[PDB]
From Swiss-Prot:
<comment type="function">
    <text>Non-receptor tyrosine-protein kinase that plays an essential role in the selection and maturation of developing T-cells in the thymus and in the function of mature T-cells. Plays a key role in T-cell antigen receptor (TCR)-linked signal transduction pathways. Constitutively associated with the cytoplasmic portions of the CD4 and CD8 surface receptors.</text>
</comment>
<comment type="similarity">
    <text>Belongs to the protein kinase superfamily. Tyr protein kinase family. SRC subfamily.</text>
</comment>
<feature type="domain" description="SH3">
    <location>
        <begin position="4"/>
        <end position="63"/>
    </location>
</feature>
<comment type="subunit">
    <text>Binds to the cytoplasmic domain of cell surface receptors, such as AXL, CD2, CD4, CD5, CD8, CD44, CD45 and CD122. Also binds to effector molecules, such as PI4K, VAV1, RASA1, FYB1 and to other protein kinases including CDK1, RAF1, ZAP70 and SYK. Binds to phosphatidylinositol 3'-kinase (PI3K) from T-lymphocytes through its SH3 domain and to the tyrosine phosphorylated form of KHDRBS1/p70 through its SH2 domain. This interaction inhibits its tyrosine-kinase activity. Interacts with SQSTM1. Interacts with phosphorylated LIME1. Interacts with CBLB and PTPRH. Interacts with RUNX3.</text>
</comment>
<feature type="modified residue" description="Phosphoserine">
    <location>
        <position position="45"/>
    </location>
</feature>
<protein>
    <recommendedName>
        <fullName>Tyrosine-protein kinase Lck</fullName>
    </recommendedName>
</protein>
<feature type="cross-link" description="Glycyl lysine isopeptide (Lys-Gly) (interchain with G-Cter in ubiquitin)">
    <location>
        <position position="42"/>
    </location>
</feature>
<comment type="subunit">
    <text>(Microbial infection) Interacts with herpes simplex virus 1 UL46; this interaction activates LCK.</text>
</comment>
Length: 63
């Protein structure tokens, strides 16, 4: 594919893990997008090396 990956995003605000598969990253935390189906999307942290669901409003596409 392309050596450049645009699937990375920044956390606009810390999220809350109300379940066991959600990710409560912090504000500004770097998160990777893995899934984009429905209102919630799946992603993974680049600093903690963990995967969890992340709302589509707390994270935006990098520019």
């Amino acid at each position: 594919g392309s050596p450049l990956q645009d699937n990375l995003v920044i956390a606009l605000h810390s999220y809350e893990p109300s379940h066991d598969g959600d990710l409560g990253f912090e504000k500004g935390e770097q998160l990777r997008i893995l899934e984009q189906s429905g209102e919630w999307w799946k992603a993974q942290s680049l600093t903690t090396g963990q995967e969890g669901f992340i709302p589509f409003n707390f994270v935006a596409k990098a520019n």
